[PDB]
Amino acid sequence: NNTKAMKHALERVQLPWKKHSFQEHQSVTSETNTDEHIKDIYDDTERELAFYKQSLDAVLVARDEL
Amino acid sequence: MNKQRTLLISSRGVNYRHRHLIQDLSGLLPHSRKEPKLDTLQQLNEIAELYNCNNVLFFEARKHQDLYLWLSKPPNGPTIKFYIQGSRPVLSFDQRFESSPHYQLIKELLVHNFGVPPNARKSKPFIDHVMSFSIVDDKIWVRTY
Amino acid sequence: KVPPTIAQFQYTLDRNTAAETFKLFNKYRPETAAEKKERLTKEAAAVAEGASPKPYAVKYGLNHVVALIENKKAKLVLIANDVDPIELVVFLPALCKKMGVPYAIVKGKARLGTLVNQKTSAVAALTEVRAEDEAALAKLVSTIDANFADKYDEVKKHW
Amino acid sequence: SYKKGAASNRTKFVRSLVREIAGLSPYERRLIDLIRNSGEKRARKVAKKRLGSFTRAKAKVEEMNNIIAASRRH
Amino acid sequence: SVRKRKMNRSSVGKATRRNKDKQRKINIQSNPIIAANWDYSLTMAQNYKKLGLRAKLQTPAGGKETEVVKKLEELASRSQSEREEEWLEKLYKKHGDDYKKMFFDKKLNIYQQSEGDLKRRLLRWKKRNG
Amino acid sequence: PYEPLIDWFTRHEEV
Amino acid sequence: VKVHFDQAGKKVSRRNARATRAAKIAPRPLDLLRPVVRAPTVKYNRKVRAGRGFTLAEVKAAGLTAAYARTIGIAVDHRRQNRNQEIFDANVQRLKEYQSKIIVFPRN
Amino acid sequence: GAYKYLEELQRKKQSDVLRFLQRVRVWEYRQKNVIHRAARPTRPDKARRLGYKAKQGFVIYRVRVRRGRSLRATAEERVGRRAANLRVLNSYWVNQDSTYKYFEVILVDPQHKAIRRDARYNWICDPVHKHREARGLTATGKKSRGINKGHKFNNTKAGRRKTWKRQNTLSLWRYRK
RNA sequence: AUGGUGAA
RNA sequence: GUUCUUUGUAAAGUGCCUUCGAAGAGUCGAGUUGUUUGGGAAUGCAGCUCUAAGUGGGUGGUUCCAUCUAAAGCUAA
RNA sequence: GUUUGACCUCAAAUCAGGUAGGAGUACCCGCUGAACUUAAGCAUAUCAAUAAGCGGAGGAAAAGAAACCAACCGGGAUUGCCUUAGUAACGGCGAGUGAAGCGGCAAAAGCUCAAAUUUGAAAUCUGGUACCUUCGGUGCCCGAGUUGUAAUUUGGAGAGGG
């Protein structure tokens, strides 16, 4: 696998969403959540809550522009 | 401006755990198209020639226990293989996606494919659910609430 | 209401032509089972104690015929309209048209059977012919092509 | 597969002979019209629906053009 | 039983069969040379090895020449038709050994048989005659 | 419903 | 709830059968001469077992003909194929010995 | 060699030639009985290629059946019941109405010396073939019994009761395993 | 429960 | 073993050379309603709607490669 | 010829020849099909692709000569046994359900149609009748059959010729 042709794919395929309003995009990009900090990756305990917290906090970023 | 149509296709042999995922995603997405069947490969690019679909969802059938999914585009789109063991939705993503072109490009596809363009043929004005996208241990996790 | 390739039949050969067909055809009778047997007993009597040419008789199995048209052996073909499954022959007038083999739909499926020692025949054809009747055949053919093929050019059309 | 199925001159002939003798079934009777007015794009759509797979319909629509083109000119 | 009971009760008589000796002591049938050299006290396999001939051709599961000579002993020791011959006489007396002319003839060579077929018959006919 | 059978194949005789 | 009480009898059944088939087929050896075959898969490919029948190819190269083989008590399987050169040699060797072994009685 | 054209003709079923033949006969058979003898088998190609010969002893029946166990089978099953002395050999589709389906089932007299004699058929005279259709031994019954070769027919390859009993009953040897 | 025999 | 008859340009087999060279449709397939299973790639079947191909078609494995030839039938242990 | 004859179709007979039914039913093949009971109430899982009921056979039945299994230095119809294995796999992962390929053995057997013309001769068969060496053969007649009965061919090719 190589990333030379991968950046060629970021050219033609990838569409601008910043020029357009949030109406057309409708996708929240929840930054700073790395989610490798989650305690217990096999037993599935903090994995349920941290994904639930990333989802509902993204609603309020989109609510202001709604 | 955002006008895209989704297309759902499945190979010979799909039921229970895979059809529950096909029949519900086709229902949750209002711009989705439900087609009979297929078998291999170049032909897939000619299906989009008919319906003017801007997206594709192909489910493969191999070693009797696994799952294989292909994901591509109409004109000159590149492919990624997957191996997992009617209200308008809201998307949510991760920091680890934008770290590299390997996951940034899949972030681009999932926005317009698995999500929704607003001007849709079966579009409902009310909201009900939010989508959960995140990466842990190299693979993606999807749940709906 | 009839689709054109069915009732390409019923527009059969006329009275005067028809009789003249049999005028020729009854000349080319296959030997009867009685006759064939006596012929051979005549041989056995002779050949047990002490040369022949190939014998012209008309040809009569649907198979045999569909073999013969398309192989060019056939010269004239006679096709009876009323048949239990019509489909058993519907292709046959077109096949002949395509191999350019002269054909005529005759009236009376039993009437074919006459000329051939059988009960019915659906189809009989005169492949090879005697020297004297060679001209008689080729003229009949022309007669048929006038009063049947050229008269009914619109048999492939009209319901 | 050694005895796959080479075309054969006789069989080819028969297929076409029958193709013209029978005429055309109602969906195909609709289909040739759907070529002559709405284009090969919309023609394939009904064909894919009316038969099973697209591969079936594709080979079907391709046979349609062979009929229409060879009919009017020759 | 119901039906069995009647039978023991009846003065008809059962269809008594003593067929239990013969299921073991089987006489060899197929070969007469083997027949005299086949000890019935011995088993099937044991009999074979006393002869020479193999009983089995594969590797068996589990464990373990006077007659065969007499078998090699037995291993050391058609005309043409009345018309065909008479028809061949007709050819030879017409052409002799000119097979080409004979093959293109119509009066004697009807069934258009080729030289090789014809001369073969002739070589044969010459062996019963001259 | 009743088109004339246009003989698209028998038009040309076989050699 | 089935129980094999018969195990004892059934063998003594099967044995008499072999006896009578031998009484019937006297000088012949009960079974047809089968080939030698490499078994399938990684788990087993170390093993060469018996196979079903010799291939027409093997047969033709041995010196005898398909139908006639069958009548000399050689098994012939027609779907088996010849891909392994070491197999092919080993079978054709097994046949030629067989043909040196056999003593074929005439029809007089 | 008509059976190449006949074959290919019968492929194009909704097409104009065969389409018109249907509407005639479908009325013609609805004139006649339920189960009756038919003279010569209407789709004779199919009859040949299902083991019918045109010799004395082979008997074609035409049968009509309601729409909605299978049809093709009941078709055979019903004729067996009437024409008792004959064995069913096979059946085939001829015509579907809106309410009724029609089959031209083929039958053989086992008692007829013409079939008792000839080699190719006298197998059917063997008493192990009384009511083939009543045991799904017809081509259709064999299909409905899911009897094929492959991965697909693993729970039903050699007796679906034979494979159930084999699994649902404990087996024990003298020297217990 | 199934399948049967009776019955103002 | 003993014999009585075997026939007719009869019936095949092998190798080589040349000339050809057809294999099952209201089926496969697809949609759906039930039934069957422990069956995850609705498996199998039925009903109903539609319904094909011939350098084909069916099934499997990482862009090819392997494998068989359905929709007819018989058959000891 | 307003006669007469072909055929096709439908009948008929206390005509000639046949045959089906019913009994048995352990086993086998279809079809139909519960409930007490098991996880906590019961719709699935579960009793259970059971019992009863229906239809159909045989000395066995069924199955069967790949639209098979495989991923290999490939096997090679089917059935059974041992093993695979309580494994894979499924199951409010629970009552639990539960294979298969390989491997070892038992036994081993393969074949027939439909497919393109006997066309220089339907070469095939049912029956009736007279004889004969009568599980049949022959002659003679009658029919059946060209909407195809025989010979040849079934992919392992095969056929035409030399």
mmCIF file with all atom_site columns, C-alpha atoms in Angstrom, chain H residues 19-142:
data_model
loop_
_atom_site.group_PDB
_atom_site.id
_atom_site.type_symbol
_atom_site.label_atom_id
_atom_site.label_alt_id
_atom_site.label_comp_id
_atom_site.label_asym_id
_atom_site.label_entity_id
_atom_site.label_seq_id
_atom_site.pdbx_PDB_ins_code
_atom_site.Cartn_x
_atom_site.Cartn_y
_atom_site.Cartn_z
_atom_site.occupancy
_atom_site.B_iso_or_equiv
_atom_site.pdbx_formal_charge
_atom_site.auth_seq_id
_atom_site.auth_comp_id
_atom_site.auth_asym_id
_atom_site.auth_atom_id
_atom_site.pdbx_PDB_model_num
ATOM 1   C CA . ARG H 1 19  ? -49.576 -17.570 -27.795 1.00 0.00 ? 19  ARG H CA 1
ATOM 2   C CA . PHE H 1 20  ? -52.567 -17.985 -30.105 1.00 0.00 ? 20  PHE H CA 1
ATOM 3   C CA . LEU H 1 21  ? -52.390 -21.812 -29.864 1.00 0.00 ? 21  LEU H CA 1
ATOM 4   C CA . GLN H 1 22  ? -52.781 -21.569 -26.085 1.00 0.00 ? 22  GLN H CA 1
ATOM 5   C CA . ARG H 1 23  ? -56.092 -19.640 -26.016 1.00 0.00 ? 23  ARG H CA 1
ATOM 6   C CA . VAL H 1 24  ? -57.649 -22.181 -28.430 1.00 0.00 ? 24  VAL H CA 1
ATOM 7   C CA . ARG H 1 25  ? -56.654 -25.350 -26.591 1.00 0.00 ? 25  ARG H CA 1
ATOM 8   C CA . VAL H 1 26  ? -57.236 -23.910 -23.139 1.00 0.00 ? 26  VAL H CA 1
ATOM 9   C CA . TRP H 1 27  ? -60.836 -23.534 -24.262 1.00 0.00 ? 27  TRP H CA 1
ATOM 10  C CA . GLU H 1 28  ? -60.739 -26.907 -26.033 1.00 0.00 ? 28  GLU H CA 1
ATOM 11  C CA . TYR H 1 29  ? -59.517 -28.796 -22.953 1.00 0.00 ? 29  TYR H CA 1
ATOM 12  C CA . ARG H 1 30  ? -62.036 -27.018 -20.740 1.00 0.00 ? 30  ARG H CA 1
ATOM 13  C CA . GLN H 1 31  ? -64.642 -28.559 -23.040 1.00 0.00 ? 31  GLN H CA 1
ATOM 14  C CA . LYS H 1 32  ? -63.402 -32.092 -22.271 1.00 0.00 ? 32  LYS H CA 1
ATOM 15  C CA . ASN H 1 33  ? -63.109 -34.014 -19.001 1.00 0.00 ? 33  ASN H CA 1
ATOM 16  C CA . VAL H 1 34  ? -60.753 -33.727 -16.024 1.00 0.00 ? 34  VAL H CA 1
ATOM 17  C CA . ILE H 1 35  ? -58.471 -36.631 -16.902 1.00 0.00 ? 35  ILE H CA 1
ATOM 18  C CA . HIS H 1 36  ? -58.633 -38.127 -20.346 1.00 0.00 ? 36  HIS H CA 1
ATOM 19  C CA . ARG H 1 37  ? -56.660 -39.980 -23.004 1.00 0.00 ? 37  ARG H CA 1
ATOM 20  C CA . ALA H 1 38  ? -55.138 -37.774 -25.726 1.00 0.00 ? 38  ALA H CA 1
ATOM 21  C CA . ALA H 1 39  ? -54.217 -39.303 -29.102 1.00 0.00 ? 39  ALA H CA 1
ATOM 22  C CA . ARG H 1 40  ? -50.788 -37.910 -30.008 1.00 0.00 ? 40  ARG H CA 1
ATOM 23  C CA . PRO H 1 41  ? -48.837 -35.938 -27.381 1.00 0.00 ? 41  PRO H CA 1
ATOM 24  C CA . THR H 1 42  ? -49.316 -32.278 -28.093 1.00 0.00 ? 42  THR H CA 1
ATOM 25  C CA . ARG H 1 43  ? -45.709 -31.177 -27.539 1.00 0.00 ? 43  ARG H CA 1
ATOM 26  C CA . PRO H 1 44  ? -44.190 -34.282 -29.091 1.00 0.00 ? 44  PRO H CA 1
ATOM 27  C CA . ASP H 1 45  ? -40.529 -33.185 -28.668 1.00 0.00 ? 45  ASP H CA 1
ATOM 28  C CA . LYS H 1 46  ? -40.951 -33.104 -24.911 1.00 0.00 ? 46  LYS H CA 1
ATOM 29  C CA . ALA H 1 47  ? -42.713 -36.480 -24.952 1.00 0.00 ? 47  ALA H CA 1
ATOM 30  C CA . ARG H 1 48  ? -39.778 -38.073 -26.799 1.00 0.00 ? 48  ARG H CA 1
ATOM 31  C CA . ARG H 1 49  ? -37.236 -36.504 -24.490 1.00 0.00 ? 49  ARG H CA 1
ATOM 32  C CA . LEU H 1 50  ? -39.106 -37.783 -21.458 1.00 0.00 ? 50  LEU H CA 1
ATOM 33  C CA . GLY H 1 51  ? -39.057 -41.385 -22.650 1.00 0.00 ? 51  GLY H CA 1
ATOM 34  C CA . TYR H 1 52  ? -42.148 -41.712 -24.795 1.00 0.00 ? 52  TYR H CA 1
ATOM 35  C CA . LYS H 1 53  ? -41.974 -43.733 -27.943 1.00 0.00 ? 53  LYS H CA 1
ATOM 36  C CA . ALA H 1 54  ? -44.814 -43.901 -30.450 1.00 0.00 ? 54  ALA H CA 1
ATOM 37  C CA . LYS H 1 55  ? -45.277 -47.679 -30.024 1.00 0.00 ? 55  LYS H CA 1
ATOM 38  C CA . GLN H 1 56  ? -48.258 -49.666 -28.654 1.00 0.00 ? 56  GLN H CA 1
ATOM 39  C CA . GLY H 1 57  ? -48.275 -49.458 -24.856 1.00 0.00 ? 57  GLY H CA 1
ATOM 40  C CA . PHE H 1 58  ? -47.374 -45.811 -24.336 1.00 0.00 ? 58  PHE H CA 1
ATOM 41  C CA . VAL H 1 59  ? -50.435 -43.832 -23.425 1.00 0.00 ? 59  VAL H CA 1
ATOM 42  C CA . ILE H 1 60  ? -50.705 -40.059 -23.084 1.00 0.00 ? 60  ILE H CA 1
ATOM 43  C CA . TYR H 1 61  ? -53.114 -38.515 -20.684 1.00 0.00 ? 61  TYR H CA 1
ATOM 44  C CA . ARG H 1 62  ? -54.101 -34.911 -20.378 1.00 0.00 ? 62  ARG H CA 1
ATOM 45  C CA . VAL H 1 63  ? -54.873 -33.672 -16.913 1.00 0.00 ? 63  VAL H CA 1
ATOM 46  C CA . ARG H 1 64  ? -56.335 -30.471 -15.500 1.00 0.00 ? 64  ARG H CA 1
ATOM 47  C CA . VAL H 1 65  ? -55.572 -29.093 -11.986 1.00 0.00 ? 65  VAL H CA 1
ATOM 48  C CA . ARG H 1 66  ? -56.583 -26.163 -9.698  1.00 0.00 ? 66  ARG H CA 1
ATOM 49  C CA . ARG H 1 67  ? -54.008 -23.518 -8.780  1.00 0.00 ? 67  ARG H CA 1
ATOM 50  C CA . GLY H 1 68  ? -52.760 -23.140 -5.181  1.00 0.00 ? 68  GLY H CA 1
ATOM 51  C CA . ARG H 1 69  ? -48.632 -29.863 -2.009  1.00 0.00 ? 69  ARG H CA 1
ATOM 52  C CA . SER H 1 70  ? -47.423 -29.370 -5.653  1.00 0.00 ? 70  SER H CA 1
ATOM 53  C CA . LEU H 1 71  ? -49.308 -29.492 -8.932  1.00 0.00 ? 71  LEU H CA 1
ATOM 54  C CA . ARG H 1 72  ? -47.162 -31.503 -11.296 1.00 0.00 ? 72  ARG H CA 1
ATOM 55  C CA . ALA H 1 73  ? -47.252 -34.335 -8.765  1.00 0.00 ? 73  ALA H CA 1
ATOM 56  C CA . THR H 1 74  ? -51.007 -34.271 -8.071  1.00 0.00 ? 74  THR H CA 1
ATOM 57  C CA . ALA H 1 75  ? -51.356 -34.336 -11.860 1.00 0.00 ? 75  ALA H CA 1
ATOM 58  C CA . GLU H 1 76  ? -49.598 -37.716 -11.967 1.00 0.00 ? 76  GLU H CA 1
ATOM 59  C CA . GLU H 1 77  ? -51.159 -38.798 -8.698  1.00 0.00 ? 77  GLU H CA 1
ATOM 60  C CA . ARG H 1 78  ? -54.647 -38.271 -10.056 1.00 0.00 ? 78  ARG H CA 1
ATOM 61  C CA . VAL H 1 79  ? -54.092 -40.200 -13.281 1.00 0.00 ? 79  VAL H CA 1
ATOM 62  C CA . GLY H 1 80  ? -52.477 -43.152 -11.497 1.00 0.00 ? 80  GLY H CA 1
ATOM 63  C CA . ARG H 1 81  ? -55.641 -43.423 -9.445  1.00 0.00 ? 81  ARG H CA 1
ATOM 64  C CA . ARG H 1 82  ? -57.831 -43.684 -12.537 1.00 0.00 ? 82  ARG H CA 1
ATOM 65  C CA . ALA H 1 83  ? -55.593 -45.516 -14.983 1.00 0.00 ? 83  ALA H CA 1
ATOM 66  C CA . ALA H 1 84  ? -54.540 -48.126 -12.462 1.00 0.00 ? 84  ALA H CA 1
ATOM 67  C CA . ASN H 1 85  ? -52.890 -50.819 -14.635 1.00 0.00 ? 85  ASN H CA 1
ATOM 68  C CA . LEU H 1 86  ? -50.482 -48.282 -16.171 1.00 0.00 ? 86  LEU H CA 1
ATOM 69  C CA . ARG H 1 87  ? -47.332 -47.056 -14.496 1.00 0.00 ? 87  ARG H CA 1
ATOM 70  C CA . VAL H 1 88  ? -46.608 -43.366 -14.694 1.00 0.00 ? 88  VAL H CA 1
ATOM 71  C CA . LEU H 1 89  ? -43.398 -42.689 -16.423 1.00 0.00 ? 89  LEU H CA 1
ATOM 72  C CA . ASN H 1 90  ? -43.340 -38.928 -16.560 1.00 0.00 ? 90  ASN H CA 1
ATOM 73  C CA . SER H 1 91  ? -45.373 -35.743 -17.052 1.00 0.00 ? 91  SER H CA 1
ATOM 74  C CA . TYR H 1 92  ? -44.948 -32.299 -18.534 1.00 0.00 ? 92  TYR H CA 1
ATOM 75  C CA . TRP H 1 93  ? -46.560 -28.884 -18.686 1.00 0.00 ? 93  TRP H CA 1
ATOM 76  C CA . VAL H 1 94  ? -48.701 -27.981 -21.686 1.00 0.00 ? 94  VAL H CA 1
ATOM 77  C CA . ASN H 1 95  ? -50.948 -25.078 -20.815 1.00 0.00 ? 95  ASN H CA 1
ATOM 78  C CA . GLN H 1 96  ? -51.870 -22.905 -17.916 1.00 0.00 ? 96  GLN H CA 1
ATOM 79  C CA . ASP H 1 97  ? -55.302 -21.347 -17.608 1.00 0.00 ? 97  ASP H CA 1
ATOM 80  C CA . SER H 1 98  ? -56.083 -18.608 -15.058 1.00 0.00 ? 98  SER H CA 1
ATOM 81  C CA . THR H 1 99  ? -57.603 -21.236 -12.651 1.00 0.00 ? 99  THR H CA 1
ATOM 82  C CA . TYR H 1 100 ? -56.363 -24.557 -13.987 1.00 0.00 ? 100 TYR H CA 1
ATOM 83  C CA . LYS H 1 101 ? -53.042 -26.019 -14.960 1.00 0.00 ? 101 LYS H CA 1
ATOM 84  C CA . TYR H 1 102 ? -52.711 -28.741 -17.566 1.00 0.00 ? 102 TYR H CA 1
ATOM 85  C CA . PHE H 1 103 ? -50.216 -31.559 -17.879 1.00 0.00 ? 103 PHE H CA 1
ATOM 86  C CA . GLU H 1 104 ? -49.649 -34.205 -20.529 1.00 0.00 ? 104 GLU H CA 1
ATOM 87  C CA . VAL H 1 105 ? -48.621 -37.119 -18.349 1.00 0.00 ? 105 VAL H CA 1
ATOM 88  C CA . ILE H 1 106 ? -47.164 -40.224 -20.052 1.00 0.00 ? 106 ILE H CA 1
ATOM 89  C CA . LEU H 1 107 ? -47.966 -43.853 -19.013 1.00 0.00 ? 107 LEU H CA 1
ATOM 90  C CA . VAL H 1 108 ? -46.930 -47.425 -19.918 1.00 0.00 ? 108 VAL H CA 1
ATOM 91  C CA . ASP H 1 109 ? -48.810 -50.720 -19.930 1.00 0.00 ? 109 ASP H CA 1
ATOM 92  C CA . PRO H 1 110 ? -46.605 -53.135 -18.114 1.00 0.00 ? 110 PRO H CA 1
ATOM 93  C CA . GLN H 1 111 ? -49.047 -55.908 -19.011 1.00 0.00 ? 111 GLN H CA 1
ATOM 94  C CA . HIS H 1 112 ? -48.702 -55.326 -22.775 1.00 0.00 ? 112 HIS H CA 1
ATOM 95  C CA . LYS H 1 113 ? -46.414 -57.900 -24.393 1.00 0.00 ? 113 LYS H CA 1
ATOM 96  C CA . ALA H 1 114 ? -44.903 -55.046 -26.473 1.00 0.00 ? 114 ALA H CA 1
ATOM 97  C CA . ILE H 1 115 ? -43.281 -53.605 -23.362 1.00 0.00 ? 115 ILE H CA 1
ATOM 98  C CA . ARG H 1 116 ? -42.786 -56.854 -21.564 1.00 0.00 ? 116 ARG H CA 1
ATOM 99  C CA . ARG H 1 117 ? -40.670 -57.965 -24.506 1.00 0.00 ? 117 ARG H CA 1
ATOM 100 C CA . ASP H 1 118 ? -38.450 -54.985 -25.435 1.00 0.00 ? 118 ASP H CA 1
ATOM 101 C CA . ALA H 1 119 ? -35.285 -54.512 -23.436 1.00 0.00 ? 119 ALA H CA 1
ATOM 102 C CA . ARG H 1 120 ? -35.101 -50.755 -23.124 1.00 0.00 ? 120 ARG H CA 1
ATOM 103 C CA . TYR H 1 121 ? -38.352 -50.546 -21.116 1.00 0.00 ? 121 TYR H CA 1
ATOM 104 C CA . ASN H 1 122 ? -39.302 -53.800 -19.406 1.00 0.00 ? 122 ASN H CA 1
ATOM 105 C CA . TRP H 1 123 ? -37.691 -52.437 -16.255 1.00 0.00 ? 123 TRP H CA 1
ATOM 106 C CA . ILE H 1 124 ? -40.925 -50.586 -15.727 1.00 0.00 ? 124 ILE H CA 1
ATOM 107 C CA . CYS H 1 125 ? -42.743 -53.936 -15.577 1.00 0.00 ? 125 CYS H CA 1
ATOM 108 C CA . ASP H 1 126 ? -40.839 -54.737 -12.400 1.00 0.00 ? 126 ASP H CA 1
ATOM 109 C CA . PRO H 1 127 ? -43.265 -54.735 -9.374  1.00 0.00 ? 127 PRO H CA 1
ATOM 110 C CA . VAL H 1 128 ? -40.972 -52.347 -7.555  1.00 0.00 ? 128 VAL H CA 1
ATOM 111 C CA . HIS H 1 129 ? -42.453 -49.652 -9.763  1.00 0.00 ? 129 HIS H CA 1
ATOM 112 C CA . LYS H 1 130 ? -46.158 -49.930 -8.906  1.00 0.00 ? 130 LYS H CA 1
ATOM 113 C CA . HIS H 1 131 ? -47.172 -46.299 -8.171  1.00 0.00 ? 131 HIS H CA 1
ATOM 114 C CA . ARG H 1 132 ? -43.922 -44.492 -8.765  1.00 0.00 ? 132 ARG H CA 1
ATOM 115 C CA . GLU H 1 133 ? -45.737 -41.129 -8.417  1.00 0.00 ? 133 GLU H CA 1
ATOM 116 C CA . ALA H 1 134 ? -47.257 -42.242 -5.074  1.00 0.00 ? 134 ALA H CA 1
ATOM 117 C CA . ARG H 1 135 ? -43.718 -42.420 -3.635  1.00 0.00 ? 135 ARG H CA 1
ATOM 118 C CA . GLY H 1 136 ? -42.214 -39.340 -5.354  1.00 0.00 ? 136 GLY H CA 1
ATOM 119 C CA . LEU H 1 137 ? -40.139 -41.333 -7.832  1.00 0.00 ? 137 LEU H CA 1
ATOM 120 C CA . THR H 1 138 ? -41.339 -39.330 -10.746 1.00 0.00 ? 138 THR H CA 1
ATOM 121 C CA . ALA H 1 139 ? -38.964 -36.549 -11.874 1.00 0.00 ? 139 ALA H CA 1
ATOM 122 C CA . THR H 1 140 ? -41.091 -34.022 -9.958  1.00 0.00 ? 140 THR H CA 1
ATOM 123 C CA . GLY H 1 141 ? -41.408 -36.039 -6.731  1.00 0.00 ? 141 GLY H CA 1
ATOM 124 C CA . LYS H 1 142 ? -37.658 -36.605 -6.826  1.00 0.00 ? 142 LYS H CA 1
#
